[PDB]
Design a protein around this ligand. Structure first.
Ligand SMILES: c1ccc(Oc2ncccc2-c2nc3ccncc3s2)cc1
Ligand SMILES: c1ccc(Oc2ncccc2-c2nc3ccncc3s2)cc1
Ligand SMILES: c1ccc(Oc2ncccc2-c2nc3ccncc3s2)cc1
Ligand SMILES: c1ccc(Oc2ncccc2-c2nc3ccncc3s2)cc1
Ligand SMILES: c1ccc(Oc2ncccc2-c2nc3ccncc3s2)cc1
Ligand SMILES: [Zn+2]
Ligand SMILES: [Zn+2]
Ligand SMILES: [Zn+2]
Ligand SMILES: [Zn+2]
Ligand SMILES: [Zn+2]
Lengths: 358, 358, 358, 358, 358
């Protein structure tokens, strides 16, 4: 009998950055049918499927007859975690952000392409709104990325502080996506916290989302163990030394802490290089109600939007040389659909609390 | 010696959407006896058995001699979870509702068919009662389905609020079945909650059934951690971002929250696009007591009844093209047994608190 | 077919002191490509890769085709833990410190070498600052190392006591790195403590980092179970007998306890042979702000810096004979870049709170 | 291909009483190199290595190529636990103490031999100090050993009661080592206690080290669940019946309970056949400060010292016939280095709080 | 190569009623040496070894070379648990007591035989003391055995109530041994209790040893959850129905409950068919102090002593026909060493608080 090439199954896992055994099992199996008569190949909308179907068709036919499908898939997913551990130690943080930028760019190529469905002018309308949320937003995003790549101790955490629906969550969400980090919850007690800080292992950045304080109940704010728990994690936030995470020994990743208006202890405040104070501007919310497509299509919280922001505002030099061809081609695509004159118009419509696109 | 085709066992699992190793083991084994002399084949009431017996008879004879039955079955059930992960990412939410609609329709074909036992006029009597429970109920159900398919953030949760035996539970039950979601319990403390929110992984929708509040004990209402727990799950309900579920990383599924008359916090209230206030109407309960067959046959809480409601009221265009032939044939079946004139009569009998069928 | 030499995979694990299955899996796999056309070989910056690529190229080609990659890697990592248990019993504590010194020295050879990026004069600037933090710092570090090697009961624990940003943490961090120990947390309750003291198994030294007391809340100090927990661990700290650790039976390793200004019980105070009282000197902090490169490059907390301190100040006799050639060559490298005259100048700039390097 | 003799790996485990899989893996592996060119063989200081290297050289060469090293080692360690269970039932308690005495004697042969480093006159200086700690100390140690071998119910527990640094801990430590028992902690709550009493399975004796009471906080004594927990363990201490230990069903082993000056309940006091009241004598501590080598070399708490005490004081008849040749030869070794006249001088120096050796 | 007969290893496990994998591993291994030159065979004191050595010598030689020793032993121990489950359902309770009686009798044959060490007149001295503890003690023991065999609901529990050192514990211990039951602890909270009641699965009888009450602290009695926990276990004690034990579904075994003088609730008191009130008689304790050999040799708490009591007092008819030959021969052995005249003398010495044997 024939024998499955585990190495080739493993190749696909690597090529698609598959961290899911089950997803790899069903994804590989869909490759057993003939590509010449394949509808998902004809549709050309799942690159993880149409770019790989011809390469894995015979191997997937063998795989379909295996008694050992999960075991083959476990080794593959394990090779992915292995490749990840290698890079977390071998790769420079700039090399890691380029790798992330390519991910968003591949996704962008697809959804804004021939077989995609997303509308670029809608995302550009989003870029405008985002650029209206803070003064020098292009520099605000750029300084954050630099902050994360450099990852300098006591100078790698940004605190987002504002009330509900003031942009803080959305910016944190969008920045987390742009970097490709993970979101943490520190409102649980010290006991369960150690396994939750483990979600930080081999991560480029992290966002401690919606950190809650105490005694602020008199202000319609929930009491939580967040600020106290974070106050303890001095070694984590500072990143002067390597911490001992459980779920590895490494410098805890840099990122963002988001919270409502709670009192920050003197000690926890000293842990932030930067504090942005988000406040609700009536014009921003009115415009969004008038531009419903943004919320409906989850555009604002997207890293693609923030990559698009940066592609629009920054020269090719402001990006890594390994991705100059990509940026350059995306700059021409933007030029086609939008001009600096019409981009300022978009922002003007935001100030007027009016629909961003006319 | 002969060797079992795991692929063919796996095929059956897929074909019947089997998520149970034990059920697949006993189901496959029943196929070892000769179909020509099979009583369950002659009875033709278990489609999962009579549609598959001829295809798996020789393989099941081999399977019956295997030392590795659970392992063969585990791979099959695993292929099912795999196929599920693939779709949760690849399939459109409309494609997922059609897949569900076909499930209810296959069940309907059977129980209302030659070998079935359920009485269609009894289910139609149920459709009437359901249509009497709310103004524009056809549009109420239709708007919910659209809500779920579109799955728009801050605009994907419906709150059902009413006292005991006022229709809220039954509608939620029936809608949950129609969509094929799961039911959750948030009255437990924050600690056990995380594994319970895991019941949400790869689900089309969810119903947080019987959410309890506090201090309402003075009103014969039980105290519970429900409303507070839900108040914390802002990121879950809104679905603006991907949450981290444990039992996957995904947008938490949309659905319904059901509760008795408890005070809803300003923050938890802002999470609902729609709030339906169920109140006990004497005529509805009297009619049901007069129509005992509905409760006895679990007709009201059935998605089949709500599919039947929609087949009765909506034109073929209001359904997906992939299921037009099915709807069309079911429309002719309804025409045979019921007329618009007699359907209004059914509703008239409900208003009179009288037996729905005469 | 060909068969992987597990012994050779195991060899690499030993040679690189790999305690990580995943890291060994991805590290071995990177050896499958041809060394002659290998970019990581041409770059010559990952010694764990370029020193081993030619030796493991054919074996890694076989490994790449294995179905048993994790199992092969588990045996290797297990041989490492085995080799560690052997030494913890067979090796003299001086032999263990030399082994550690070689580790820092190999790292130093690389980062200060042809393919390295670190700047030696920056680390030397760090040596200066460190030597300004305490009187007779060379003798302070030297006495600690002797303390650890000798590991004499009731005379093997040093207590670092000072406020935030006074050098205590940094010295403890740097000394921990120089020895190659682990850091512990005793602020958790007695229950979870036993598994945390397990982090001490087969360790040369340990640092109980940031031990918290009680009632000192009136002084902006957090309440913690640290001092009480440590007060109980008399048998641990003294090291007169073998304790029973869980995660082995051994003398608990010696080291440091660091704490803010909290009251030390009479009994816990008797457990320390030495107590250094760190106090914030304005000139030290001003100079560091003026020398940002130190903090940015994590130089102060490095054992490499403290090895460099000792290489600068101590004659070849003050080190073990097994590493005389290394010390001697590093002494010539330092002579080239720095003189005693310019080293005193560096210290003079520290006293002036001025940039250490001119 | 060649095949490893598991039986021979198992033999080595038995021969060295190896209860550690990892230690056996690294210990066996060190035997793969040629004994003729082996430095650890030439050094002749690790009997577990030099006595076995020639016997396991070829088998270790095979072992080095095995894919199944941990499994081979697990069976070996399991044979050790098996051999232990056999003896705990088959061996007489005198046979078990001889087996222990041989262990200390083999260790003594080595460290006081050609390749050893320990100084016998230093240990003899220790014997003196120990003999000064209690009247008729030779008879005190002898009566304890008899107590343990006979293991008579309600007459097998000795309570050591004294303040910090009064000899109680050291005697308990030394006696525990002489017998080869284990140390227990009963200051934890009843819940975790059952698994901790499991440390007692197949043990010759146990020491409940540093048992704490309550309300004695007014006397600078820590509150603990020790005395109460022990008060419950009537069936354990008495040893009239077989208890049900969890980690076996057996009589709980006899031994010592050590505590500071806390009130002993009437019921817990009735459980002790003997109570020795240790009190700090200024001369004993002064002499020890003057003889630093004792503390530094962990001589006092050693069973070797107490075996040496007994070899010095007791005639060959006072020991088991199976070890008469060993005792006799050790008696000649002592005669060479020490006389009764100079031993009394050592004790005289203790009374004077002066260095024991002149 | 040769292959081990697992069936024969399994045979030995059955033959010796081995419930311990490790004990079976070391016990089987001791059979590898030649019986003709075997010292344990020549000694003839371990029947589990000398009766089986010749039968398992060749198989044990094969076993010694196995890689699969624990697995072979696990199947054997499993066959024992299997044989036990079979009997718990198939065997009559009289058949189970005979099986137990044979166990004590085999042990008696050995220790009172040619190679034994126990002195029969010492055990007979014990029989006397035991017969002095209660009026009609032969009938008291006999009625208990009948009680246990019949196992009639609400009429199968005996409550032993008395203070410390009044005979209650010793009688319960001795009766538990005679029946071959297990001892339980109900002083723990309801949570851990369910796994502890699991110790009752496939048991002939159980003793809830030292059950503690509350509020009796004013009487130097410890507070405990015993009496309350037992009060809940109505279905357990009564044995009218089958309970659901966890560690099986069966009637919970009958036995004894022992407690100090605590108040028994009306409901818990109704659960006892019999209550014996043990009180300290000065003559009984004085005699025991005068007969130290009894306590030292654990004679009183032995089932062998109570079997010996019954062999002395009861005619052959009072025992099961399957063991008449054994009883008859033991009756002749007793006749040889003791007469009714000298047995009454023994009892007379007990009343006088004098040494039982003259
Ligand atoms: C409904 C509910 C909420 C809405 O607002 C938003 N929803 C989703 C994401 C962001 C926003 C807003 N961001 C800002 C930032 C600054 N000033 C005001 C706002 S509002 C809009 C409609
Ligand atoms: C016994 C117990 C309960 C009953 O009522 C029901 N039982 C089962 C399901 C639903 C209902 C009702 N729904 C409504 C909705 C609106 N007004 C009144 C009702 S009563 C009927 C009989
Ligand atoms: C910002 C934040 C903190 C800073 O100080 C430091 N940071 C990192 C590591 C060490 C220090 C200091 N060590 C000492 C020792 C003695 N006197 C004063 C100091 S300050 C400097 C800038
Ligand atoms: C430092 C710290 C403690 C010291 O004492 C000791 N250390 C280690 C072990 C034992 C002792 C002592 N044993 C006794 C017994 C009776 N009277 C006095 C003592 S002191 C000595 C120096
Ligand atoms: C020491 C400690 C205790 C002792 O008594 C005992 N020891 C062990 C087992 C039983 C007893 C006793 N049983 C009874 C029964 C009735 N009256 C008095 C007693 S005394 C004897 C010595
Ligand atoms: Zn395709
Ligand atoms: Zn059939
Ligand atoms: Zn290379
Ligand atoms: Zn050697
Ligand atoms: Zn024998």
């Amino acid at each position: 009998t024939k024998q499955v090439s585990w190495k080739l199954v493993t190749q696909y896992a690597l090529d698609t950055k598959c961290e899911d055994v089950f997803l790899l099992m069903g994804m590989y199996l869909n490759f057993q049918e003939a590509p010449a008569a394949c509808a998902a190949c004809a549709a050309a909308d799942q690159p993880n499927h149409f770019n790989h179907h011809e390469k894995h068709y015979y191997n997937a036919q063998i795989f379909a007859d295996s008694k050992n499908q999960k075991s083959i898939c476990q080794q593959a997913v394990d090779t992915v975690a292995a490749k990840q551990r290698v890079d977390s130690l071998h790769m420079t943080r700039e090399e890691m952000l380029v790798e992330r930028f390519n991910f968003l760019l591949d996704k962008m190529d697809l959804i804004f392409g021939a077989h995609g469905n997303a509308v670029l002018e809608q995302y550009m309308a989003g870029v405008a709104w985002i650029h209206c949320l803070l003064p020098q937003m292009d520099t605000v995003i750029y300084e954050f990325l630099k902050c994360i790549v450099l990852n300098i101790p006591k100078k790698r955490y940004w605190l987002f502080k504002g009330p509900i629906d003031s942009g803080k969550t959305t910016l944190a969400a969008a920045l987390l996506d742009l970097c490709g980090g993970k979101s943490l919850n520190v409102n649980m007690p010290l006991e369960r916290l150690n396994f939750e800080l483990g979600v930080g292992i081999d991560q480029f950045m992290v966002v401690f989302e919606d950190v809650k304080g105490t005694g602020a109940e008199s202000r319609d704010l929930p009491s939580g163990h967040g600020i106290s728990n974070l106050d303890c994690l001095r070694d984590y936030l500072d990143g002067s030394v390597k911490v001992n995470l459980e779920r590895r020994t490494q410098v805890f990743p840099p990122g963002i802490v988001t919270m409502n208006e709670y009192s920050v202890p003197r000690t926890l405040q000293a842990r932030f290089v930067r504090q942005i104070d988000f406040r609700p501007k009536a014009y921003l919310r009115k415009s969004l109600s008038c531009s419903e497509y943004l919320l409906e299509k989850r555009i604002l919280q997207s890293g693609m939007t923030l990559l698009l922001l940066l592609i629009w505002f920054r020269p090719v030099a402001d990006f890594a040389a390994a991705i100059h061809e990509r940026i350059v081609q995306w700059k021409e695509r933007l030029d086609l659909e939008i001009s600096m004159y019409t981009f300022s118009t978009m922002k003007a419509n935001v100030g007027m609390g009016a629909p961003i696109l006319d």
